[PDB]
Amino acid sequence: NPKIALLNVELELKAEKDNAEIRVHTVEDYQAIVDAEWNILYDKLEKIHHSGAKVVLSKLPIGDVATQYFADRDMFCA
Amino acid sequence: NLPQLEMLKNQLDQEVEFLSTSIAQLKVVQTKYVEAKDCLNVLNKSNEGKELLVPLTSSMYVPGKLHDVEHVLIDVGTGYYVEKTAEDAKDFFKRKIDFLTKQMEKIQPALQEKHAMKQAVMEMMSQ
Amino acid sequence: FNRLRQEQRGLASKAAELEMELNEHSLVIDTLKEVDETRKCYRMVGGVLVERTVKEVLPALENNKEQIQKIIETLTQQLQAKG
Amino acid sequence: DAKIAVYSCPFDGMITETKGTVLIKTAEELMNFSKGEENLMDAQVKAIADTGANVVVTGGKVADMALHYANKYNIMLV
Amino acid sequence: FARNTSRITELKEEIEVKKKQLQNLEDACDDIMLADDDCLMIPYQIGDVFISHSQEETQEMLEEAKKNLQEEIDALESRVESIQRVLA
Amino acid sequence: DEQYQKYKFMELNLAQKKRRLKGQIPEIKQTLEILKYMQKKKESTNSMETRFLLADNLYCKASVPPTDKVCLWLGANVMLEYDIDEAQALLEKNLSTATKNLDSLEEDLDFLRDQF
Amino acid sequence: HGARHPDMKKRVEDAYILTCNVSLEYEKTEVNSGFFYKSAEEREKLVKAERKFIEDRVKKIIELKRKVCGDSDKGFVVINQKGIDPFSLDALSKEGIVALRRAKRR
Amino acid sequence: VEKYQQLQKDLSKSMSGRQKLEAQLTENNIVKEELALLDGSNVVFKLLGPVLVKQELGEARATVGKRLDYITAEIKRYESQLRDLERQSEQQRETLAQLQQE
Amino acid sequence: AFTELQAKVIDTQQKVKLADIQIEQLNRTKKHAHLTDTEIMTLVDETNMYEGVGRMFILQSKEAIHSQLLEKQKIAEEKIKELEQKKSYLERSVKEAEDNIREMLMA
Fold this sequence. Notes:
This is part of a larger assembly, with 9 protein chains of 9 kinds. In chain A, 37% of the residues lie in helices and 10% in strands. Chain A is an alpha+beta fold. Chain D is mostly helical. Chain D starts with 27 loop residues before the first helix and ends with a strand. At the B-F interface, helix 1, strand 1, strand 2 and strand 3 of B face helix 1, strand 1, strand 2 and strand 3 of F. Chain F: It is found in: Cytoplasm; Nucleus.
């Protein structure tokens, strides 16, 4: 009895990025930039899947990596 | 003929108003020197050394006796010194005021004479 | 336009300036009210610097408002004279 | 005995401020508008004393917020 | 919001002028160390007062002004760099 | 529409406030540190030949004893003098606390007015 | 034209006439300190409070009505170049006073 | 018109500085011209900020002279920008006119 | 042509706009002088006192206050009467010129 999610906005490669600049302090710091590149998207997908729906549809193309994180949500996207 | 002249009369009015702001600047520049002349009379009255209450920047007052009229000082230029001597502090800063007032005449006479043509342009603009 | 505009502006400003003076004389009262202008002090009134106990400051600082208030009220009512 | 409150367009359509060229990013312009409409019809059920208006007419859109405000105030709006 | 320019341009120019003023103060210190280095009389100013007494006592405020300028201005240079990096 | 014109008007009438406020800030600073640095120690120590302002253009030599008396004015009618320890105490708030509100009502006000 | 006088004593036969302009609708004083400077905050508020002048002029008309007729019976007819309010016209029609509005020049 | 406006801005920012230096120079000329002959009543020192150092007249004269040379060079720079502006005023302004005409 | 004569009459009007300013400046400054005189006559009731030009305060005794409240106000007084004896001249210059230009030049 799947509850469905009716989406149009998507998550895909190369679509968005952050133009951050950070001076070197250690080697553990650069992951702040690569985090900021995707953290809002990860939280977005996590919450929109945890919304209460349990299968999700999207009118625009979705990434295979996004599909794998949706599988991590025990979930599928079209 | 008339329309283009009337259109450019707005630019003429704006330049005249800029020069009127310049002559308002002329009315506001005399101050420093006019209270300098007003403060002339303090110098000779206190040449024995006398207690003064004077501002520190603008808003502070601290008691203190003035002395050493022989090195009363004025600032000038990029950081040069004008050490006013005692006899100057009595009488000769009167002529120093005369020369500063001479620059004040470079301000009022020598600029009002050339703004006479400004007012002439105002009168001509009626045509 | 002009024959009315400059006349109204001048008659308004002639007491608007005194209204700003009253604004200054009202913002200056903070020293007396809270900054404790009550001791033996070297008070000045402009050009003069008096070492006096401040007894006259209350009547002097009320006598200005008791006049300028009615001046500015007269200006405010005069603004409505003609439209 | 609904002594009509007569107006042409006592309400307006949708708008949204732009902070510069780009659009604003706050919902206060909508929350304050909703509360203003609510208090306006509260003043309506106050001014029924001197107007006696159970009905009103408009040429401008209103939302379901005005619908339930009217339902709690027992008024009609064409 | 790309507010960086409106918040970094004035800071850059004022830091530049403060650095120039500190360099000129260092020049003044050097000058009083060689030009008119006479021990007996030297008008030296602390805010709004000359005292023509300090020759070696001049450093008592020379160093004060030096550090109160340099530490504050390079701290605020780090601040304007922080304003730059927070946006990019 | 009118957004650009009103935005520019607000920017102008708040930049004038910026200019004015950082206009009075420097001299009140000077009032604090000039006294607290020179006089509080040296004048309290011994009397020296000094320089005081006769006017904003006439500068006169002077000498001061350990007078240790200071006077504050906020207007053309109301005066109060103070010692050399409580005077800086009352003056230091008027900038140290004033900057936090006035400049936050400048930096944060500009941040809001870029959208307000 | 006529006026906003419901149930006028239309047959004013003892029609005393004095055709001066009565400002029974005072033109709002928008001009106080020029055009839209910062002082327009005065114009936003001084535009109001003109309601009193209508009744003051009406009281003047009532005084002249008393003077010329000695009572409230005989009809006194006066004019206005501009509009006049209906609410005070309701009382003026009871006072034996006939004010009229929107008159042309000649 | 791009080039004309750029040259106008260059003219403006050069002439503002030229005029301010003229305003200060009109005073320093006289002050120094009697200063060079009134010795004893005033003596040359340098008020280089909040300090005083004994100073000699010659380096002050060199300073004011190289001020004069600098400002004259800036005047010719400004006036060259003026001819540049008037030269652009023909063709860089006909740029739009010819495209609207044909 | 009458163009230069019209220039002269407008110059006379400009001199009128000089006259009103030059009398009003001194009457406001004289009102300020009277206010200062009333204040100085009020404050002489106490002794330990300072005066100056605002930018300084010099100590004195009471007789110095009496001397200063008169010696400068009387200069302002002699100067106000100088300015009436000047204003009468210049207002004659403008008004009689008007009397002989306005009903004359329109011919």
